Design a protein around this ligand. Structure first.
Ligand SMILES: COc1cccc2c1C(=O)c1c(O)c3c(c(O)c1C2=O)C[C@@](O)(C(=O)CO)C[C@@H]3O[C@H]1C[C@H](N)[C@H](O)[C@H](C)O1
Ligand SMILES: CCCCCCCCCCCCO[C@@H]1O[C@H](CO)[C@@H](O[C@H]2O[C@H](CO)[C@@H](O)[C@H](O)[C@H]2O)[C@H](O)[C@H]1O
Ligand SMILES: CCCCCCCCCCCCO[C@@H]1O[C@H](CO)[C@@H](O[C@H]2O[C@H](CO)[C@@H](O)[C@H](O)[C@H]2O)[C@H](O)[C@H]1O
Ligand SMILES: CCCCCCCCCCCCO[C@H]1O[C@H](CO)[C@@H](O[C@H]2O[C@H](CO)[C@@H](O)[C@H](O)[C@H]2O)[C@H](O)[C@H]1O
Ligand SMILES: CCCCCCCCCCCC
Ligand SMILES: CCCCCCCCCC
Ligand SMILES: CCCCCC
Lengths: 1033, 156, 48
């Protein structure tokens, strides 16, 4: 094959060209995103029940929906929350690989059939079935700076004039409004209501009658009277369109003939659909849009398109309106791409410098310069064909493959140059002989490397999905690299390399290079002399090897694992938790204090604070809030002190002061769904109808026991909410019946006034919007207010609520959880330092075995996978190990010689562990994929050394030692050349600071440390491996 | 209402006896009340923490503290079936006939929930069998409406 | 039933259309809302 192309350089150029064209096309059409999809598909059902408490939501909506989630394919598990904001969310999570669209339609279809079982007011609000995602492309904030607009005014503006244009913008998959379009707000006054013997029931009835669409018919409709000249539609009552019209709604006509209008018993205005969130941006009222990338789209294009759309909306903004960008992943992503291109180009330049330094001609220096880009371009082509995107993972997959690609180029060319200098063979014949020496090995190498990387594509769940990205990228690159080495590089060598006279090693050259040559020729002799002595003393080096292996084991066990390193992404979060029952106003004071700190004591670093009062992650309610902090650009934040981790620590430090509120700051995770390594996610389950209180006691029992094992378990805690005081009111049925008051009137009077009620729709400047009735605030604040609400009896008398009700305080849950259709309580925690999560989990199970009868448990999320897609790592490395051995055995036609290559594995691993341990790093994916490439490269070096030695023995009848000495003599230069280039090339990643430096450091340090020891150790150990293995067998 | 007041409310509700002990040593306000007017004694009575109830009463807790709707710790203990707490409270001066704002008494509540033993203890301590809530109901009315034949006998 | 084109369009057509965003392989969308209260929205997809 290489011989084929050596006589057909043009056919080889053709192949190269087709690959470059395919690659260029792919690079133009490839999707770009920070991360590919990784979490298993999940569908969320969401419902609102205005005015409802958690138990009401759970028992009339949640249980009913859950009981209908049958006959849906590939469900792993289901969980739900029902809470006192009147909200339910049920999340159904599917097997990896499930078609998300099919999953969603199957859920939505089962829901559709359950809708008639749900309360009217819930059927009326509607129940959303959506695909779950947690990643936004960007968040566009919309603020008013001149004090003329409330957040509700802004949200409506955004909904009416911005959202839809954004949704239609190229590459946008979904857009979420932070707030609602206006609702017609009717704020009732119980004092007026009673003044005229009216109730919210009459208000509701009047609005339904006087704000409505009424069908009529046609004039001259078919079938007509013949001779009819005209056919026209008849238009009757249509919906109201203004606050004025609603104010004029007629409620009652008094005898004196006076008219009671709705405006006489209520305040009427356009307002929000709800009032649980208060959003501020640097203390200014705010709304916004959360935007998500559409499947297969290009993040950078889409971001630019969104801004182009926003720009052309500006001219029409009302005074004071301004767009802000608190969150945008696009700038971070641009840097990653630039940093990666920079790395690949410098690598090619380093290879250029090293080739020239050692080979001292520009023709040799040209060959890798051509071959490597061809391999890269082709890798893009194969990735595009596999449906991959350009993302953080696939991009580092490529830089992790740099050593391997650079090496293939260097190996082929260096070997031809050596053959010419050693035999004065003309370039074409030299190239034939040279490829003859290495081609078998290059093929064997391609098999071995596949055996090393492919198995990584077979892990399960989320981690598997991450590994898959590196696996296929590296394997594709590696395969293309071998193909180019067998096809293109040999033809280039045969046509571009100039002859070298037999014996000329440039030692007679003048100036710096003659010196380098002399210097290096004799360093090679010292090298061989040294291997010579080593090979008279193999015993002690076996001892040094076992010491290396042991230190590796040691270092490895103590190197903490993680997933992906944190980044200064230019933003971070701060949580605000006030005591249960705290009011919205109290939370607001803390947020204000938080905001004040950031804009004051971090003014140099902080661009903005987006304070969301009323929003939580593990709970909503007036006592929870979040402060989303956006930072100035990295360039204006020089120094470790002005970076997210530091700012975060200072922030939390400062907020530990804050009285009755838990307040703290934290950086964002690279990917929310992975949680933490060490982290587990546990569900306690009511298996026997025990009820909420007994489940709570069981939970506490388990939490107290966990706390007795600080050595194994840390921060073992409830993910949900504690019970709180609630106001129980009993209607007396007998008294209501005696007074002639209906329960319907009593119950809608209470609910409408105190909880609010969605009556129907109206049309606001062309857009359909909701009408809500509720009491004006001051009449639904305290228990004493209850008795100021009157209900009309059958005889027309007005009856105060106090006459037919009684009340008392009690405790209840503001948030009820279920897991797989049973009452549950989620418990989070992590393994203690030096402990595996498996160990932590084993204990949790032990502790759980001792809980009251009828209490069970399960593992969910990351722990669910662990308990599964984490029992594969040793079966996969075993296959890998066996396949590698088998390939080697076929390469060398021996069952023993393969051992001399495989012994090389620890040599690179020890250096990677040393560097990571010393730099204070962790055993993460970048580290791990790097071990594989580092191992891959050293294996390749050993394979060629052994191949040469063995061939010298088989073919030239040479002694074991003689052959080993000569082989290692010939392999030294190309091995050093590659290491120098690759080591220098990864150094920028090692020392890098700033954006993306987390990932860069993780890839670079392990690689540089592994390459150092692999290079230095292998050139002394593989000759030992070979000699000892041969002697033994 | 103080650092220690708050912690005492929490500890009493959670039934953390050791914490309460330490808080008593440090002067934590036994009369701390939350928004709805519940004292640590209310909390302990509701959640059935007997030892904490006794510790609180030894440390000058108001056995007849009432909440914002006029309910006492005895109301809670009697309603939720905490027999021995009920006995302790009454030993310590609890008003057996306290009426909340609805005119409801501990007897009404024990009756309503069919807590026979508690009903008998209450009567023992002078519970007024003829007391009427805002609706004119007695514990006997409650028992026949519930169809609790036994309790109705006890209340002849 | 009974609604005119304009009413149908404001209460139905535009409501559905504003949710027909980010569907894969969509080439274009067209709709009409008529005097019989009837609405039709047609979404045409990329070939293949
Ligand atoms: C207005 O104020 C905000 C201001 C800044 C950010 C925010 C919000 C906000 O309201 C908001 C949300 O309401 C929601 C989310 C959110 O991230 C924010 C902000 O970041 C995410 C979400 O998935 C959950 O929190 C569920 O646990 C959905 C949830 O909303 C609801 C309404 C959705 N459209 C969806 O239909 C479902 C009901 O979740
Ligand atoms: C590109 C990276 C290059 C940087 C490398 C830096 C050098 C550091 C490691 C070099 C190791 C070589 O060390 C080598 O050990 C053997 C023995 O084990 C020595 O050999 C000598 O000592 C041994 C035992 O004491 C005798 O059996 C042997 O006959 C004798 O000649 C070599 O004289 C020495 O060269
Ligand atoms: C030359 C080209 C390269 C060839 C590379 C070959 C890769 C092929 C991957 C196949 C392995 C898939 O992963 C699959 O994991 C499950 C466990 O969850 C294994 O099932 C088995 O392994 C586990 C080990 O953890 C053991 O308990 C037990 O042997 C059994 O359960 C399967 O035997 C294995 O096949
Ligand atoms: C628009 C922006 C969207 C981003 C949403 C992010 C989702 C996470 C919120 C829920 C978690 C709440 O609390 C939790 O948050 C963090 C995870 O993100 C945790 O933080 C954890 O992960 C961080 C990021 O990788 C690390 O810097 C921390 O060392 C680690 O503790 C907090 O220790 C924990 O208290
Ligand atoms: C002259 C012998 C040529 C040797 C070819 C070796 C090919 C090794 C392939 C490894 C396959 C698993
Ligand atoms: C992109 C075009 C590259 C083609 C180079 C062909 C060189 C042929 C020399 C024989
Ligand atoms: C949109 C062009 C991106 C190129 C990244 C390799």
């Amino acid at each position: 094959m290489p011989n084929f192309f050596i006589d057909r350089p043009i056919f080889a150029w053709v192949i190269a060209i087709i690959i470059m064209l395919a690659g260029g096309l792919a690079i133009l059409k490839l999707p770009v995103a920070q991360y590919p999809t990784i979490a298993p598909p999940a569908v969320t059902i969401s419902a609102s029940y205005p005015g409802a408490d958690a138990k009401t939501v759970q028992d009339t909506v949640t249980q009913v929906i859950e009981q209908n989630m049958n006959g849906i394919d590939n469900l792993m598990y289901m969980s739900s929350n029902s809470d006192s904001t009147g909200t339910v969310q049920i999340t159904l999570t599917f097997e990896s690989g499930t078609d998300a669209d099919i999953a969603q339609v199957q859920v939505q279809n089962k829901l559709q059939l359950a809708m008639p079982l749900l309360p009217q007011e819930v059927q009326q609000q509607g129940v959303s079935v959506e695909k779950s995602s947690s990643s936004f492309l960007m968040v566009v904030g919309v603020i008013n700076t001149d004090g003329t607009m409330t957040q509700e005014d802004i949200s409506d503006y955004v909904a009416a004039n911005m959202k839809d244009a954004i949704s239609r913008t190229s590459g946008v998959g979904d857009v979420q409004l932070f707030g609602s379009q206006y609702a017609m707000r009717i704020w009732m006054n119980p004092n007026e209501l009673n003044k005229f013997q009216l109730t919210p029931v009459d208000v509701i009835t009047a609005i339904k009658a006087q704000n409505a669409q009424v069908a009529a018919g046609q004039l001259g409709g078919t079938p007509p009277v013949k001779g009819q000249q005209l056919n026209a539609s008849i238009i009757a009552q249509t919906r109201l369109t203004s606050t004025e019209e609603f104010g004029k709604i007629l409620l009652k006509v008094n005898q004196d003939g006076s008219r009671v209008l709705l405006r006489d018993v209520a305040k009427i205005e356009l307002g929000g659909e709800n009032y649980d969130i208060i959003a501020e941006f640097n203390g200014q009222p705010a709304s916004g849009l959360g935007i998500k990338l559409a499947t297969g789209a290009n993040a950078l294009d889409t971001a630019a398109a969104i801004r182009a759309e926003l720009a052309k909306m500006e001219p029409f903004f009302p005074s004071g309106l301004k767009i802000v960008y608190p969150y945008d992943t696009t700038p971070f992503v641009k840097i990653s791409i630039h940093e990666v291109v920079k790395t690949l180009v410098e690598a090619i330049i380093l290879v250029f410098l090293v080739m020239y330094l050692f080979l001292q001609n520009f023709r040799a220096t040209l060959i890798p310069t051509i071959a490597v880009p061809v391999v890269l371009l082709g890798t893009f082509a194969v990735l595009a064909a596999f449906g991959f995107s350009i993302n953080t993972l696939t991009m580092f997959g490529m830089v992790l493959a740099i050593g391997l690609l650079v090496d293939d180029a260097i190996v082929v060319v260096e070997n031809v140059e050596r053959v010419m200098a050693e035999e004065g063979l003309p370039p074409k014949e030299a190239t034939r002989k040279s490829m003859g020496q290495i081609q078998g090995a290059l093929v064997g190498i391609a098999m071995v490397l596949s055996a090393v990387f492919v198995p990584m594509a077979f892990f399960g769940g989320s981690t598997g999905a991450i590994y898959r990205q590196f696996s296929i990228t590296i394997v594709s690159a590696m395969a293309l690299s071998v193909l180019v080495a067998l096809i293109l590089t040999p033809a280039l060598c045969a046509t571009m390399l100039k002859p070298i006279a037999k014996g000329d090693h440039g030692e007679g050259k003048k100036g710096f290079f003659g010196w380098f040559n002399r210097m290096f020729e004799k360093s090679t002799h010292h090298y061989t002399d040294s291997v010579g002595g080593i090979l008279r003393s193999t015993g002690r080096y076996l001892v040094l090897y076992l010491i290396i292996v042991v230190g590796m084991a040691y270092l490895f066990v103590r190197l903490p694992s993680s997933f992906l390193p944190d980044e200064d992404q230019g933003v971070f979060m701060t949580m605000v938790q006030l005591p249960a029952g705290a009011t919205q106003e109290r939370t607001q004071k803390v947020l204000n204090e938080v905001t004040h700190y950031y804009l004051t004591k971090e003014k140099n670093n902080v661009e903005s604070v987006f304070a969301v009062n009323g929003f939580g992650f593990a709970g909503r309610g007036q006592n929870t809030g979040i402060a989303f902090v956006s930072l100035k650009d990295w360039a204006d934040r020089p120094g470790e002190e002005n970076k997210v981790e530091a700012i975060t620590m200072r922030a939390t430090r400062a907020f530990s002061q804050i009285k009755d509120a838990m307040v703290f700051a934290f950086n964002l995770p690279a990917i929310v769904e992975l949680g933490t390594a060490t982290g587990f996610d546990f569900e306690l389950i009511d298996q026997a109808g025990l009820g909420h209180e007994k489940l709570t006691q069981a939970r506490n029992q388990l939490l107290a026991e966990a706390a007795k094992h600080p050595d194994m378990l840390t921060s073992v805690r409830p993910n949900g909410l504690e019970d709180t005081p609630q106001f129980k009111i009993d209607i007396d049925q007998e008294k209501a019946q005696a007074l002639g008051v209906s329960i319907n009137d009593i119950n809608t009077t209470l609910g409408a006034a105190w909880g609010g009620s969605y009556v129907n729709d109206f049309i606001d400047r062309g857009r359909v919007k909701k009408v809500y009735v509720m009491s004006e605030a001051k009449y639904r604040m305290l228990p004493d207010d209850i008795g100021d609400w009157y209900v009309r009896a059958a005889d027309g008398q007005m009856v105060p609520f106090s006459a037919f009700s009684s009340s008392r305080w009690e405790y209840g849950s503001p948030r009820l959880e279920r897991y797989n259709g049973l009452p549950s309580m989620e418990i989070l925690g992590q393994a203690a330092p030096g402990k595996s999560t498996g160990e932590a989990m084993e204990l949790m199970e032990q502790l759980a075995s001792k809980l009251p009868t009828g209490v069970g448990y399960d593992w969910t999320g990351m722990s669910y996978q662990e308990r599964l897609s984490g029992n594969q790592a040793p079966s996969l490395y075993a296959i890998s190990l066996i396949v590698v051995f088998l390939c080697l055995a076929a390469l060398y036609e021996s069952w023993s010689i393969p051992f001399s290559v495989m012994l090389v594995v620890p040599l690179g691993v020890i250096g990677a562990l040393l560097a990571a341990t010393f730099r204070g790093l962790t055993n993460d994916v970048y580290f791990q994929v790097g071990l594989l490439t580092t191992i891959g490269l050293s294996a390749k070096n050993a394979i060629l050394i052994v191949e040469f030695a063995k061939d010298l023995m088989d073919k030239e009848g040479k002694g074991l030692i003689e052959a080993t000495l000569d082989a290692v003599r010939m392999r030294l230069r190309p091995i050093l050349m590659t290491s120098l280039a690759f080591i220098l090339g990864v150094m920028p990643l090692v020392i890098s600071t700033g954006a993306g430096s987390g990932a860069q450091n993780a890839v670079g340090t392990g690689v540089m440390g592994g390459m150092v020891t692999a290079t230095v150790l292998a050139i002394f150990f593989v000759p030992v491996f070979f000699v000892v293995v041969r002697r033994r067998f | 209402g103080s650092d220690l007041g708050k912690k005492l409310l929490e500890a009493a509700r959670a039934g953390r006896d050791d914490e309460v002990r330490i808080l008593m040593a440090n002067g934590a306000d036994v009369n701390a009340a939350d928004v709805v007017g519940w004292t640590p004694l209310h909390l302990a009575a509701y959640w059935g923490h007997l030892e904490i109830v006794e510790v609180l009463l030894k440390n000058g807790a108001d056995v007849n503290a009432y909440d914002t709707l006029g309910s006492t710790p005895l109301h809670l203990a009697a309603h939720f079936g905490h027999l021995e707490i009920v006995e302790v409270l009454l030993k310590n001066g609890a008003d057996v006939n306290a009426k909340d704002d609805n005119g409801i008494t501990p007897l009404h509540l024990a009756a309503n929930r069919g807590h026979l033993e508690i009903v008998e203890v209450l009567l023992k301590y002078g519970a007024d069998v003829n007391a009427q809530d805002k609706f004119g109901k007695t514990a006997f009315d409650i028992s026949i409406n519930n169809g609790n034949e036994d309790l109705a006998e006890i209340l002849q």
